[PDB]
Amino acid sequence: MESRIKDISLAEFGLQDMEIAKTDMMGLVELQRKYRDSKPLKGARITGSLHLTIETSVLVETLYELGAEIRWCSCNIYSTQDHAAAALVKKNIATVFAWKNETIEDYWVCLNDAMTWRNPNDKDKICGPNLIVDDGGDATLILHEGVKAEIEYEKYNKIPEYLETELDENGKQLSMDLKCMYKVLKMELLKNPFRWRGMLKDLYGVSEETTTGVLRLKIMESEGKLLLPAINVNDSVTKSKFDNTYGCRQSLLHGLFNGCIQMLAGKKIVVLGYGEVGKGCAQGLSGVGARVIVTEIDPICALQASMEGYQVSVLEDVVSEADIFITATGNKDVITVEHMRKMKENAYIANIGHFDDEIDVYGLENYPGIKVIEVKQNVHKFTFPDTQKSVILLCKGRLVNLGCATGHPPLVMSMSFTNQVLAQMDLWKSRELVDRSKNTRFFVKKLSKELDEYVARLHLDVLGIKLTKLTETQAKYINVSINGPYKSEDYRY
Amino acid sequence: MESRIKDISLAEFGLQDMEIAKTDMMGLVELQRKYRDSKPLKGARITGSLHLTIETSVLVETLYELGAEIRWCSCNIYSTQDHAAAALVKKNIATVFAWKNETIEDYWVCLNDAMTWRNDKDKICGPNLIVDDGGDATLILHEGVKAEIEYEKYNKIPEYLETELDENGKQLSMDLKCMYKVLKMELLKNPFRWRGMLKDLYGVSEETTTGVLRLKIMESEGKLLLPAINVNDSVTKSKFDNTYGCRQSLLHGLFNGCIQMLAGKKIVVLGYGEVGKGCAQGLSGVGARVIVTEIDPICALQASMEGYQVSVLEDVVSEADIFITATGNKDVITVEHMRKMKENAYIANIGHFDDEIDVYGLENYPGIKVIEVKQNVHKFTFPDTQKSVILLCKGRLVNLGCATGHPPLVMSMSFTNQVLAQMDLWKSRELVDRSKNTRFFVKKLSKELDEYVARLHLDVLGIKLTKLTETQAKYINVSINGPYKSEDYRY
Amino acid sequence: KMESRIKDISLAEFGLQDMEIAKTDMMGLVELQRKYRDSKPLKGARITGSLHLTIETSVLVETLYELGAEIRWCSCNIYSTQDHAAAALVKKNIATVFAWKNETIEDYWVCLNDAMTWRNPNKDKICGPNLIVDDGGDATLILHEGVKAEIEYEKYNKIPEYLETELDENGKQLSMDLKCMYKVLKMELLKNPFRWRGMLKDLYGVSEETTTGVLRLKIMESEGKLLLPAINVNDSVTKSKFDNTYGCRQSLLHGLFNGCIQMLAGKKIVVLGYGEVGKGCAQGLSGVGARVIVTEIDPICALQASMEGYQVSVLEDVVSEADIFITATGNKDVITVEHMRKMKENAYIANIGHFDDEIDVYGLENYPGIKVIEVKQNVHKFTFPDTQKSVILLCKGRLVNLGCATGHPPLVMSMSFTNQVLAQMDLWKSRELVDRSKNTRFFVKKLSKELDEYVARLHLDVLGIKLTKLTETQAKYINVSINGPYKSEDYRY
Amino acid sequence: MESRIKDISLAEFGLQDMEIAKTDMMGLVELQRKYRDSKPLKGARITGSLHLTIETSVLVETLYELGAEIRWCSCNIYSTQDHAAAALVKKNIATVFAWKNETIEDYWVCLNDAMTWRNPNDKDKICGPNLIVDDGGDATLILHEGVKAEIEYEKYNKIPEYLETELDENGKQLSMDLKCMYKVLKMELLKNPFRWRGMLKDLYGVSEETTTGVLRLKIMESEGKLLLPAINVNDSVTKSKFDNTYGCRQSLLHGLFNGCIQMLAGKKIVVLGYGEVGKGCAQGLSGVGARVIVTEIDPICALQASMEGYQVSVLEDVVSEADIFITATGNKDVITVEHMRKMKENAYIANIGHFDDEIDVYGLENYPGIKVIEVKQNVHKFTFPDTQKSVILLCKGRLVNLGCATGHPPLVMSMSFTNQVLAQMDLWKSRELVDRSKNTRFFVKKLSKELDEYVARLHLDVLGIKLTKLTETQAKYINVSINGPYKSEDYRY
Numbered sequence A, D: 001m002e003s004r005i006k007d008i009s010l011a012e013f014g015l016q017d018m019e020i021a022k023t024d025m026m027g028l029v030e031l032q033r034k035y036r037d038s039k040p041l042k043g044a045r046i047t048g049s050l051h052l053t054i055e056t057s058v059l060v061e062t063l064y065e066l067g068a069e070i071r072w073c074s075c076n077i078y079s080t081q082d083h084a085a086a087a088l089v090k091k092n093i094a095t096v097f098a099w100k101n102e103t104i105e106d107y108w109v110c111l112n113d114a115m116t117w118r119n120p121n122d123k124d125k126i127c128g129p130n131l132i133v134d135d136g137g138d139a140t141l142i143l144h145e146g147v148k149a150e151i152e153y154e155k156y157n158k159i160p161e162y163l164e165t166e167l168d169e170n171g172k173q174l175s176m177d178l179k180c181m182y183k184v185l186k187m188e189l190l191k192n193p194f195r196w197r198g199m200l201k202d203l204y205g206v207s208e209e210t211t212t213g214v215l216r217l218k219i220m221e222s223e224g225k226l227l228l229p230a231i232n233v234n235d236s237v238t239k240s241k242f243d244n245t246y247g248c249r250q251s252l253l254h255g256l257f258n259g260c261i262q263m264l265a266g267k268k269i270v271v272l273g274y275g276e277v278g279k280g281c282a283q284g285l286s287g288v289g290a291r292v293i294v295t296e297i298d299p300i301c302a303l304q305a306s307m308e309g310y311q312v313s314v315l316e317d318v319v320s321e322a323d324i325f326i327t328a329t330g331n332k333d334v335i336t337v338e339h340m341r342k343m344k345e346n347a348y349i350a351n352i353g354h355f356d357d358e359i360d361v362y363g364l365e366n367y368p369g370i371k372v373i374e375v376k377q378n379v380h381k382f383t384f385p386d387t388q389k390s391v392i393l394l395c396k397g398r399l400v401n402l403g404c405a406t407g408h409p410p411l412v413m414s415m416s417f418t419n420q421v422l423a424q425m426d427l428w429k430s431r432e433l434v435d436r437s438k439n440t441r442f443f444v445k446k447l448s449k450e451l452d453e454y455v456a457r458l459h460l461d462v463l464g465i466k467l468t469k470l471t472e473t474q475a476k477y478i479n480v481s482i483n484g485p486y487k488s489e490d491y492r493y
Numbered sequence B: 001m002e003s004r005i006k007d008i009s010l011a012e013f014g015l016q017d018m019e020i021a022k023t024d025m026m027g028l029v030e031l032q033r034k035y036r037d038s039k040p041l042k043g044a045r046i047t048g049s050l051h052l053t054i055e056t057s058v059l060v061e062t063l064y065e066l067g068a069e070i071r072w073c074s075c076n077i078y079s080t081q082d083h084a085a086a087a088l089v090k091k092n093i094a095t096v097f098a099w100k101n102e103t104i105e106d107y108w109v110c111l112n113d114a115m116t117w118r119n120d121k122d123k124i125c126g127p128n129l130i131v132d133d134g135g136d137a138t139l140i141l142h143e144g145v146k147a148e149i150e151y152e153k154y155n156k157i158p159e160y161l162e163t164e165l166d167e168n169g170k171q172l173s174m175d176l177k178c179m180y181k182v183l184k185m186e187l188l189k190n191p192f193r194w195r196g197m198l199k200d201l202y203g204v205s206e207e208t209t210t211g212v213l214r215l216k217i218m219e220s221e222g223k224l225l226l227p228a229i230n231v232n233d234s235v236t237k238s239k240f241d242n243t244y245g246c247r248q249s250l251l252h253g254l255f256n257g258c259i260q261m262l263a264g265k266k267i268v269v270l271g272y273g274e275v276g277k278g279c280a281q282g283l284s285g286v287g288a289r290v291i292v293t294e295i296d297p298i299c300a301l302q303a304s305m306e307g308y309q310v311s312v313l314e315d316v317v318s319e320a321d322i323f324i325t326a327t328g329n330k331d332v333i334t335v336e337h338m339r340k341m342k343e344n345a346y347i348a349n350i351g352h353f354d355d356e357i358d359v360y361g362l363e364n365y366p367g368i369k370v371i372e373v374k375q376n377v378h379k380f381t382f383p384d385t386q387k388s389v390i391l392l393c394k395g396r397l398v399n400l401g402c403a404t405g406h407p408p409l410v411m412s413m414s415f416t417n418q419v420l421a422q423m424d425l426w427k428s429r430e431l432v433d434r435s436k437n438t439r440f441f442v443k444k445l446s447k448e449l450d451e452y453v454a455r456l457h458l459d460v461l462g463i464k465l466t467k468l469t470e471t472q473a474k475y476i477n478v479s480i481n482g483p484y485k486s487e488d489y490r491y
Numbered sequence C: 001k002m003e004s005r006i007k008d009i010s011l012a013e014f015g016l017q018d019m020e021i022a023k024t025d026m027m028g029l030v031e032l033q034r035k036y037r038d039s040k041p042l043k044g045a046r047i048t049g050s051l052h053l054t055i056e057t058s059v060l061v062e063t064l065y066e067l068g069a070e071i072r073w074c075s076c077n078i079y080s081t082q083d084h085a086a087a088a089l090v091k092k093n094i095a096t097v098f099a100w101k102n103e104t105i106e107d108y109w110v111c112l113n114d115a116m117t118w119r120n121p122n123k124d125k126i127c128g129p130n131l132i133v134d135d136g137g138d139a140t141l142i143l144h145e146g147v148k149a150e151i152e153y154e155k156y157n158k159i160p161e162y163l164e165t166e167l168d169e170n171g172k173q174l175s176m177d178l179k180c181m182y183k184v185l186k187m188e189l190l191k192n193p194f195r196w197r198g199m200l201k202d203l204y205g206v207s208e209e210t211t212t213g214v215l216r217l218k219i220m221e222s223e224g225k226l227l228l229p230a231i232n233v234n235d236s237v238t239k240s241k242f243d244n245t246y247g248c249r250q251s252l253l254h255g256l257f258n259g260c261i262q263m264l265a266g267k268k269i270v271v272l273g274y275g276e277v278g279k280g281c282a283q284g285l286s287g288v289g290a291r292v293i294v295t296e297i298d299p300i301c302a303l304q305a306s307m308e309g310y311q312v313s314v315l316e317d318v319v320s321e322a323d324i325f326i327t328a329t330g331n332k333d334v335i336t337v338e339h340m341r342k343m344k345e346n347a348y349i350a351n352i353g354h355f356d357d358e359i360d361v362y363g364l365e366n367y368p369g370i371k372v373i374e375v376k377q378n379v380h381k382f383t384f385p386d387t388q389k390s391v392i393l394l395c396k397g398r399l400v401n402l403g404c405a406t407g408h409p410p411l412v413m414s415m416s417f418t419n420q421v422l423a424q425m426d427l428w429k430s431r432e433l434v435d436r437s438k439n440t441r442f443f444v445k446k447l448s449k450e451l452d453e454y455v456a457r458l459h460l461d462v463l464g465i466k467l468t469k470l471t472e473t474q475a476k477y478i479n480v481s482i483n484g485p486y487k488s489e490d491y492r493y
C-alpha cells in the first residue's frame, strides 16, 4: 500500500491498547454505536494532522465507522506512538504517514502526502480533502501558504523569491520548519501551480484542536484571510477545562518522570504561563511536592496563581536559583540563551506549549563552542564553553508530555475527540452552505452548549457520577430547562 | 440624624478596623487617591443594599470621597457588622439603616428608608444610583412601580398585596409579606412614589449571582426600568470573591457555628459552581471528605477531576455529617431529607437566599422542639424519632450570618468593580432618555477595566508581572498593555 | 475555699447544651463513662486539674466525676477558659472551679493555688490532691517550687530572698508569671511553711498533656528532683499525631480568622518550628491558599518541610517581606523586638506554642515611646516611634487557638482526654507502690501501645471507619496478634 | 567477562546518568570526598542484593572509592536498570550478576554467585563476603537456609527431603522462589557441604534496607537464630520518613503511568495498607485527582487516613466498584483470586510491597482456562473464562515502582544509601568484637540519631534549605546541644 510508518509488526499491541483505552473513551464508543449504520460521514475525504497516539487511533476508527475515508499524519516530529500507527494500517482504515522521531524534512512531506488524494475518475488528477482535523494549524497553514505561493507565482511567472531564500524579512535565518515547508511548496508549484487553489473548491471546513491553532485562525478571520469554515474545538468547555488542564496535570508529570531523572519534591520549578495548561502543570507538580514559581504577563492569571499559594516572579528574578523550567505560554522567546547561561548546573528545561519556539533551542544548539551529548533518547545535555556549566533539555523543546511520554490519557482525549467528531459531522452536514460564488472568506465558530453538555453526559458513567435531576419548579426558579443547557453562554465554569 | 444602628459607641473599633483593612484594599485606596480631588460622583445620590461589613464601610468611604451622598442598608438580617455601621455614622459619611439580627419586618423598613431621599420639607425623591447585592433594592423598585400602575387602574390596593397566600394556596414567605406591607403603606401615602424615582434613576450595579439572575429575567421580559451593570461577572469578582472568598469565609462561618471537627467528616456540598468550588477546596483543606451534588454534567465532571464523589442527596442523606447548600436554587434540602439525617447532623446554606433549605417547614413541623445552642444556631428535634438536626443561622448565608464574610483583599477586588460601575453609570446618565420608550439592558465592565482591578492589587501580594516585548505581543495578537485574553476566555 | 470563682453562672445552660453536642464525637469519654460509672474505679480520689477549661474539658471533668473522683479545676492560660463551660460544671456541682477568660496574671496563680487546696476534715487544716491533671506543668511547678521554698525557708527561719526580688541572677526583670507565682509561695510560707511537703504524703501522680510540660518533667527526672510518679500523655500516639497536628490544622485557622481580619490566601506566612504543631499549622495555612515559609533548627524537620513544598529560611532573611509570623517552637526568644522593628506595616504576629516566651512581648510593650491600641478583644496594634510602622499582635503572644478562638474540636480532644482518664486510672490503681518512707526516685512513663490502639478503636465509629481484621495466617506472617498491638515500640506512624 | 549482565554497550548511558544523579546525591558525593584517601573499607569483601538502578551504581561507586571489593545482584527479577549494571562492569568497580527480566531460576543463581568469592591466596578455594548490603533479606535468607541445610545434611548423611519435594507440609505447591532457592542449596551441598558454615567465620554483618527484610531479621533475632550482626537501615529517620513515603509518592505514579494507560483522576483507587509506603502512595494519587479509599487493620493508621480525608473500607465492600487496587501492606493474601473474580472489567491491580505475596498471582495464573495476553512490557491482561471479564496486572505483582518504572529518584536514594555506607563502616570497624567462639547470640541495632541528623545535613544544600542555629540561651532552655541531637530517642517526626 502507500502508508509510511515505522513497523507494521507492532499492530497487535496497538489494537489491544485501543480496546483497553475504549473502556474510558465512552464518548467515542457511543458515537460509533449510534452512527455506524447510518454513516453520516459517507463520501467525506478527511485529512488529519494530529499527534497519532492510541487515543487518536480510536478517533480515526470512529470517523471511519461513520463513513469517512481518512489520510493522517502527526502534528509533531516526536509525538507518534508507532504501535498506534501500525494498528490503523493493519486494519486498513486510514492511509498513515507518521512515525516517532521524524526529521523536520520528513514531517512536511508526510503532511503534504496526507493532504494529497487520488481522483477516482482520473488517474492523472490529484485532489484534496473535503474536511480537515487539525491540531496546531499546520494543515491549515500549508493550505493557505500554498494558495499565497500560487498567486505570487502567477504574478511574476516564476518561483517567488521568498521560497528560495534561507533568511526572513529581517535577515535572520528561517526556522527549519519554514524552510522545510517552503521546500514542499516549491516542489508543488513546479508540478502543478493550481494544486492548492484546486483543493479549496472542495474544502468544506477544518476543526481545530489547540490554543495555538485557534490563535492562527483568529488572526486569519480578523483580516479576511480564512478561506474555509472553521470550528474551534479547543474552546468547547469539555475540551479546554479538561484536556488542557487536567490532561497536563497527569501527562506533564509522566513526561518529566521519563525525561528527568531527578526527584521533583522540594525543587523550585518555574511554570511560565498560568493559563489553562499552566494551571494543570502547577497542580500536578505541587501534588508531588515541588515548590512552583509562576511567571505571567496577565495580571488576572498572576492573581489566580497567588490565590493557590504560588510565588509570581519575572524569570530573571529566579533564573539562577530554580531547578526546573517548564514553558506553557504559547508565546515565543520566553526562555532565551542568555537565561540558560545563568542557570545552575544541570538545571532542566522543558516545554509543554504546542511549538518549540517558547525556548530558543536553535540559539542553544548553535551557541559558539556549545558541547552536546545525548543523555537518553530525546534528552540532551548542553555545556557552555566559558563556564563549563550544563543545562538539560527535554526532547529539543518540543511538547514534553507527547515527546518524552504518551500524551494525555484516554478519558480526557475521548472528551476532546467526541467534540472533534461532532465538529466534523457539523461541517459535513452544512457543506451546501459553502458557496464560493458568493463568499470566499469565512469565520470561526464553536459547538453549542447543548452538545458540550452532551459530551460530558457521555462520560459520567466512566467515573460512577450520579447526576441530580431538577424538579419542574426548581427549573422554573432558576429559569432553565430540566434538560439544559444549565448555564448562560458567558459562564466560565 | 436619622440613622438607625445598634450602637454608636462602637465607632472607634470600626474606624480602626477600616484602617487595617485598607492595607489590603489597595484598589479602593488608589481610587480615593486618584479621584478625591476631581470628585467624579459629585452630586450623585447613591442608595446601597449590601451586607454592611468593615469592607463595605471602605466602599462607602470611597464613594463619599468621590463626591457622592450615601444612604445604606444591609441585604441580610444577620450580615451587618455593628462596629462597621457605627463608624460610617460617627464620621458622617452616610445615613445608615442596619444592624445585626434585624427582624424581617425591620429589614424591609430599612431598605425602604435607604431608598427615601429628601428635597420642600415633605417632598421626597429617590436615588440616582443603586449598589445592590441580591436584587432587593431593584425588586422593591420594580414591584413598587407595578403596584402603583395596578392601584391607579382599579383605584384599589392590588389584591395580591393583601393576601397571605400565593397562586397555589401556600403561605407567602415572611420576606414577601413584609415587602408587601411596606408597598401597601407607600401606596396609601403617595401612589406616584416609585414611578417618580424613575425620572432621576440612572442605574444599578449588581454584586451577586442571584441578583444577576433576577436582572436577566427582567431584561428578557422587557421589564427592566433602568440601566444595569453586572459586577458579579467581572473576572476579578466571580473568580475571586465567589470562589476564594468562600474558601476562607465558609470555614470561618462553620468554625464559629459548628463546634465539631471537620476532618474525616462526610460533608455534602450541594452545587459545584463558583461558590461550591471554593467551599469544597476549603473543606478538603482541613481534612473533610467532600461529596458533591450537581445537576450540571460539566460541573459534575469537574468535581470528579478534583477527587470528589458525586452523588444524589437521597443516596447520602442518612450517612453524611454536614450539608452545605451552594446552588442559588430552592428546596434543595427538604423537611423529608432532614428527617432521615443522623443525630446532630449540621445544615448550613451559603447561597444568597435561605430558600435552598425548607426552614419554614422545619420550624412549623408539628410537635417540633427547638432550642438555641448559641447565637444564631438552633437545634431542632423531631417528636417521632427524637433525632435532632442543627441549623446554622436559620439557613441564611452562613459566612456572613455566623462569621464576618469575605476578607478585605477579595472584597476590595469586588468593590473596585462596584466603584468603576457606579462611575460608568453616572458618567453616561445623559443618555438615559425617559421620553423615548427604550429598553434597558444588563452590561458588564470592559476587560480593560477588569485587568486594571487586578493590577491595583498585585503589590499587596508581592506579585512581579512580566512585560511582553513588541515581538511577543504581535506573536500572540495582543497589545503590550492588554487586554490579554479574548472575551470568551474562561480563566 | 469551697466556693467556685467564675465569670457568670447564668451561662450554664449554653455550656450544658454544648457539652451534649460535643459528646456525639467524644465517644472515648462517652464509653469510659458507660463502662466505669457503676464500679467507680476513681472513688475517693482528689483530682486537681490545671488545663484550659473549654467545653471539651468539661466533658473530661464529667468523666472523672462519673468514675468517682472529687475535682478542683483551673485553666493553664489566662485567656483559654470558655466561661459557659466553667458555668456548666459549677451548676452541675461536679467540680469546684477557679477559672475565667481574661484573668490577670496575679489571679491566674491564685486560681491554681486555690485548685490545689483541699479541705481537711480531720480540725480545719489543708490537704492537697491525690492526683494531678496538668497541661504545661504549672501545677507540677508550683508543687515543686513550693517544696523548695519551704526547705529554703527552714534553713534560716525566714522568707527566702529570691521570692522577694524583682530580678533574676543576671539582673533582668523576672517575668510577671514568675513574680506572681513567687508571691503566692511567700503568702503560703507565711500561712503554713509545711503546706507543700504535707501534700506529698497523699500525692500519687501527675498525667501531663503537652510537649512543654513533658520537657519540664524530663528535666526534673534527669536531675533526680521529680517528687511524684508521672505519665506522659503528650506522647501517646493517639495524642501527639492527632491533637498536636490535626487539632492545630483547624484551631490555628479558627484563631487567625477571629483575630486577624486579613485574607490568608497569597500571603507569605512564616511558621517558626516544623514539629508536630508546625506541621499541622502549615497544612491548614496552605489549605486556604497561604504561601508557607518554614524556619527550623532540626535538619530532619527542615527536609520534611521541603518535601511538602515549603521554602525553609532563617527569620532574618524573610522578616522584612513576610506578612504573618506564627511561632510553634516551644522555645524562647524566637521573635525579638529587633525582628519586629524590621517587619512591614501591619504585619501580624501570633504564637501557638504553650507559653508566650516565644515572642518578646515584654520588650515590645516596654519599648521606649511605643504606642499601643486595642484593635478588638485580645488583639493589639503596636507602633514604633522612630519609623511610625506598626505590628499587630494576637492575644499578647499567648497560644492563639485558645486565646482568639476555642481550641481544638471535640473529636481530637476526646482522643487526648481518653488518654488522660486512662493515665489517671493507672496512677490511682498503683498508688500502693508509692512508698515515701524510702529514698525513692520517681520517673516518667507512657501508656501502653495496647491502650493507645484502644483509644483509636473507640473513635472509629464517629467517622464510619471500617477496619479490616487479620486472618490467622496473615497474623502469623507479620508476627502479630489478631487483636494487636500491630506495630513495634519504635514505630513512628 | 565474569559478570553476567544484559549488554555492556549501555555503559556510556549509565555513566552519564550517574554523573547527573550525583548532582542530588550529595550524601554519597561527600562520603567519597571525605573518605576516598583513607579508605576505611580497604580489604572488605561486600556482597550486595539490592535493586541495581543508577542510584545503586552510585552506592557501589562510593563503597569502591572507600576501599571495598564488591559483588552485586538485584533483589527483584524486574528491578535492574541494564545501563546501570553495564556502567559498573565497564569501569571495573564491581562484579555484577543482574539484568532486567530475570527468570526466577536465574535470580537465585545470580545471588549465589554474588555470595561466591575466590580467596586471594588460592584460585581453587571458595569463600564468602565479609559484609552484606541486603534489601528484602534474600542474601541473609540463603545464608541461614544454607546453614540449616548443611546441618540437616550431616544429621542423616544425605540430601534433606524438604529440598527435593515440590510440596509443603500442608500439601500445597511451594513458591517458585523457594523451589529455585532449594535447587541452588542442593547443588551447593553436593559441591561442598561446609560452604555456608565456612562463610560465617569471616562474616561481620548485614545492613538491611527495607521493612520486610527487617521483619525477617527481628523474627530470627527473637528465636535466637541470627548468625551475624545486623544494622536496620530501614528505621533511620532519614530512610523511613523519606524513601518509604516520599520516594513512593513519586515512583508509584511513575510505575502506574508507565503500566496503566488510564487517567487516574476521578478513579476509585484502593490503597491497601496506610503505613509509611501507603501514606506516600495516597498522597501522590490524590495529587493527580484520584479518589483514594484505604484499607487497614491498624486502628491508629485508619484514623490517620480519615484525618487526610480518605474513606476507610474493607476490601469486600468496594472490590466490585473500585477501579484500581494498590497493595502496600508487606503482608500476604491481601488480594485473592476470589476478589479478582468480582472486579469490574479492566480493573487494574498492582503491588508496591517488597514481595509479590500480597496478591495471589499463582492462583490467578493457575485458574482453569484463564487467558493471558501481554499488553506491554511487564503488563498482562487475564480473562476469566466463566464470566469473560478481565483484570490487568502490573509486572506480575512484583513491586511496581521498580518493575514498571525505575524506582525512587536520586535525592531520597542518596539519603537511604548514605545510611547504608555509614552502616557498612560501623560493621567493618567493629569486626574485632565479633568472637564466634564465645558470643553466639547476634542482635539488630540502628544507627545513632547523631548520624541520622548528619545524613539530613548533607542534603540541605540540594534544596536551598537555610537552617537556623540555636543561641546558647535557647539550647539551654530546650535542653539540647547547639549541634544536636535535637529530639528525644522516641520522637516520631
Ligand SMILES: NC(=O)c1ccc[n+]([C@@H]2O[C@H](COP(=O)([O-])OP(=O)(O)OC[C@H]3O[C@@H](n4cnc5c(N)ncnc54)[C@H](O)[C@@H]3O)[C@@H](O)[C@H]2O)c1
Binding pocket: A468, A470, A474, A486, B208, B209, B210, B211, B241, B242, B246, B270, B271, B272, B273, B274, B275, B276, B293, B294, B295, B296, B299, B326, B327, B328, B329, B332, B350, B351, B352, B353, B397, B398, B399, B400, B406
Ligand atoms: N455567601 C457569599 O458570600 C456568596 C458569594 C458569592 C455568591 N453567593 C451566592 O451563592 C449562590 C451560588 O452562586 P454561584 O456563583 O456559585 O452560582 P453558579 O451558577 O456558579 O453555581 C450554582 C451551581 O449549583 C448547581 N445547582 C443548581 N441547582 C441544583 C440542585 N438542585 N442540586 C445540585 N446542584 C444544583 C448548578 O448546576 C450550578 O453549577 C448564589 O445564590 C450567589 O448569589 C454567595
Ligand SMILES: Nc1ncnc2[nH]cnc12
Binding pocket: A050, A051, A052, A053, A055, A056, A247, A402, A406, A407, A408, A409, A413
Ligand atoms: N494522547 C494524545 N493524543 C492526541 N493529542 C494529544 N494532546 C495531548 N495528548 C494527546
Ligand SMILES: Nc1ncnc2[nH]cnc12
Binding pocket: B050, B051, B052, B053, B055, B056, B245, B400, B404, B405, B406, B407, B411
Ligand atoms: N464581607 C462582606 N461584605 C460585603 N459583602 C460580602 N459578600 C461576602 N462577604 C462580604
Ligand SMILES: Nc1ncnc2[nH]cnc12
Binding pocket: D050, D051, D052, D053, D055, D056, D247, D402, D406, D407, D408, D409, D413
Ligand atoms: N531506585 C532504587 N534503587 C534501589 N532501591 C530502591 N528502592 C526504591 N527505589 C529504589
Ligand code: NA
Binding pocket: A053, A054, A055, A406, A407, A408, A409, A410
Ligand atoms: Na495519550
Ligand code: NA
Binding pocket: B053, B054, B055, B404, B405, B406, B407, B408
Ligand atoms: Na468581611
Ligand code: NA
Binding pocket: C054, C055, C056, C406, C407, C408, C409, C410
Ligand atoms: Na475547643
Ligand code: NA
Binding pocket: D053, D054, D055, D406, D407, D408, D409, D410
Ligand atoms: Na531509581
